[PDB]
Design a binder for these strands. Structure first.
Ligand SMILES: [Zn+2]
Lengths: 107, 123, 241, 95
RNA sequence: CGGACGGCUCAGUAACACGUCGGUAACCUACCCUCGGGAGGGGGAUAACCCCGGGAAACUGGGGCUAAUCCCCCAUAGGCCUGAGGUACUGGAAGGUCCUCAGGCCGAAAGGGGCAUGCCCGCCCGAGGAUGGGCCGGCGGCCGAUUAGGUAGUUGGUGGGGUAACGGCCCACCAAGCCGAAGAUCGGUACGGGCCAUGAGAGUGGGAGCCCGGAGAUGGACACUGAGACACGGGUCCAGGCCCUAC
């Protein structure tokens, strides 16, 4: 039972790069986002929005940050889906996060 | 003109002598690790060296030094000079652990640029 | 660019937990590694020279230490860089003096005088438990020390309990458990040196540490970290504070 | 010149008595180490040897100066603990 | 044993360099602390020293002799890899630790010194801590469009090598991805911060001297020894300059 409380997938993975049933360990922070690209093999890009305060002008500006995450087969997430990700060790040059759960699919 | 340093181990003593002429010309071309009968050079051990030394004695080459003051090294062939990176001698006293230097030495083979020679007796 | 470890400490960069005049000189004593951390310990020379006053210069202090006159948990210590920390007992028999090292409410280290009967005991918090070769159990304690116990008596020891020991010989007596009426002393944080009784313990997910809720004498409730709560009794302090 | 002891402490680890005293000198100059030690021992029943004065210090306008001395039990410990410069400064020792 | 700290400077760098919060269950660590255990049996050489020296110096040859906490071997403990089982521990989460079996590779130690009739200082293995570092991530911090497309190990995958360790860090094979008008790329300028100057404040400007961090040692590259360096009073080469010389 990996530390995070969510309903694990309904299928049994055999891939060592899967937290559920495998050897990839998650440790640290957890955030939500929305998938923007699903073209790489086993790779998803995730976006989240946030407001940044500007002091002199007393106002806010919106910003977007992107993250590259590992996407296992038992948890297969495509464009448009809302998803939760967690930090782990380096997997490639640009990927150090892994998908843990899909919260709401898209159409 | 070649100077010789003749060493006797049985007592641990050495004598220096001068040489010139064909007796010197004979040494040229001879490498370190070779045995020579003394008389060929035109000398005799009895008189000048010490008490008494059995005949058929044989001098062995072990090293020497040249005009400018650089030593011979057995594992460098030829009569010419070289500069090489050394970690131990002969030709180098390290003075510190893992230390290396680029020293110039003389080759394994004798040539008129040489001055002194070191000979050991084999009984 | 540094090519190896440090051997110097500037006095402005010294820990806050020390009583030290930071602008009087340039250098401070750099502590050697040992029983406690840099953030919970002070070298002996500062105790012998500044906190107590038996010496005015470091040469005099070093002569005192080399003559063999200061004990820490009942053991002779001659290194002036040796670190003394929380719950350690400092003893001087030529004077009959016995002190316990504790923190203030500001977070600084002080010496509390105690008696010779209590200068024989020292508590230790258990920080971890291991199996070692021979199917034996190792307890890793709060000052970095280690103690061995058997299988049969393994369930009597846990990772936030406290063990009281005779110090030079290290014999156990009076295990104290972490419970809901246990008397606690706080060692770090904003509420350092407050005491009271455990009221509640909460756990969190994904690596975040556990929190403890405590009730003080006046009835005021407060919170701290379980790893900062040091058990010293069941309902009354086994030692003086 | 008169003297008035103000604090005595005993150091058993180093083996000495630390003596803080006041000196009173009105209309007079700052007294000398000789006289100060003389009166100190004459009063407190000490051996002149085994005793060192660290300092006599005068302040801006006071006529009341401060002084600090150290009384040892044996001269061997005295010389093994104290640095040579104060011994030369008092006169117990020649260079 | 130490000399890898201290000290000096800001040329380079718009970068995970710096700041802050976190992580390493993916790593190393001599000196120090605690606990648990060990010190058996055999060998060798060589500096000093003596007899001869060479060379202007810098430096350096031969022969004889001899010690160790110097060096080497044997064994035993111990370490690492893999396969099959069991289920004692920790933790939020384990083949990470523990137990049993099997097939193998590597492989310790100075019972040395002082005192005295047991003590002090040291040597090796294991488990942990401390200290000091390596690596990763989220967030934040200059100007230019009279710089608009950039990228080809480039983005990712499978399987391996190498590393103290994760990783296109490197390799073979398969694909076509990665960044960008919310300013990519290119260029200009510059060590970063804590702080400082000024002003009623909002703000504008700076960041040499003290502390923390980073980088450098004529320019540019490459290695040996060591716990730790590609080394600030050490080494090798090229360029550039300077000096001694019996050339
Ligand atoms: Zn699965």
């Amino acid at each position: 039972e990996i530390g995070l409380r969510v309903q694990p997938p309904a299928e049994v993975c055999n891939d060592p790069k899967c937290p559920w049933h495998g050897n990839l360990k998650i440790h640290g922070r957890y955030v939500e986002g929305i998938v923007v690209s699903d073209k790489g093999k086993k790779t998803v890009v995730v976006e989240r929005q946030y407001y940044h305060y500007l002091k002199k002008y007393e106002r806010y500006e919106l910003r977007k940050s992107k993250v590259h995450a590992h996407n296992p087969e038992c948890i297969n997430a495509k464009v448009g889906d809302k998803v939760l990700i967690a930090e782990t060790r380096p997997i490639s040059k640009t990927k150090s996060w892994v998908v843990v759960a899909v919260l709401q699919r898209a159409e | 003109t070649f100077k010789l340093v003749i060493s006797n181990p049985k007592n641990g003593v050495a004598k220096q002598v001068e040489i010139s002429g064909p007796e010197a010309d004979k040494l040229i071309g001879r490498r370190i690790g070779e045995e020579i009968p003394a008389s060929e050079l035109g000398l005799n051990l009895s008189e000048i060296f010490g008490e008494e030394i059995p005949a058929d004695a044989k001098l062995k080459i072990t090293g020497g030094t040249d005009k400018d003051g650089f030593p011979m090294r057995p594992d460098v062939h030829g009569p010419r000079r070289v500069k090489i990176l050394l970690s131990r001698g002969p030709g180098f006293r390290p003075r510190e652990r893992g230390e290396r230097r680029k020293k110039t030495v003389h080759g394994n083979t004798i040539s008129p640029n040489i001055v002194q020679v070191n000979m050991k007796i084999v009984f | 660019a540094r090519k190896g470890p440090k051997r110097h400490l500037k006095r402005l960069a010294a820990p806050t937990s020390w009583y030290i005049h930071r602008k009087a000189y340039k250098w401070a004593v750099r502590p050697s590694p040992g029983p406690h951390s840099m953030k919970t310990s002070i070298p002996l020379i500062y105790i012998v020279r500044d906190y107590l006053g038996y010496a005015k210069t470091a040469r005099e202090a070093r002569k005192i230490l080399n003559e063999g006159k200061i004990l820490v948990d009942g053991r002779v210590r001659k290194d002036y860089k040796f670190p003394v920390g929380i719950m350690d007992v400092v003893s001087i028999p030529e004077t009959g003096e016995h002190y316990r090292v504790l923190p203030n409410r500001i977070g600084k280290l002080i010496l509390h005088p105690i008696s010779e009967e209590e200068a024989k005991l020292k508590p230790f918090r258990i920080n971890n438990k291991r199996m070692v070769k021979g199917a034996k159990v190792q307890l890793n304690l709060h000052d970095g020390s280690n103690h061995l116990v058997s299988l049969a008596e393994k369930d009597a020891y846990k990772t936030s309990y406290t063990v009281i020991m005779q110090v030079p010989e290290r014999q156990i007596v009076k295990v104290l458990p972490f419970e809901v009426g246990a008397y606690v002393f706080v060692t770090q944080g904003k509420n350092v040196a407050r005491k009271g009784k455990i009221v509640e313990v909460r756990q969190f997910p994904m690596g975040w540490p556990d929190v403890v809720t405590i009730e003080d004498e006046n009835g005021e409730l407060f919170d701290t970290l379980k790893e900062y709560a040091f058990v010293i009794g069941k309902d009354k302090p086994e030692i003086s504070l | 010149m008169e003297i008035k002891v103000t604090e005595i402490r005993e150091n058993k680890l180093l083996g000495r008595k630390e003596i803080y005293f006041d000196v009173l000198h009105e209309g007079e100059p700052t007294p000398s180490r000789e006289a100060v030690k003389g009166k100190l021992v004459a009063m407190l029943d000490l051996d002149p040897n085994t005793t060192v004065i660290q300092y006599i210090r005068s302040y801006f306008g006071s006529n009341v100066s401060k002084g600090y001395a150290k009384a040892y039990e044996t001269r061997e410990r005295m010389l093994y603990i104290e640095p040579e410069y104060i011994l030369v400064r008092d006169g117990l020792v020649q260079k």
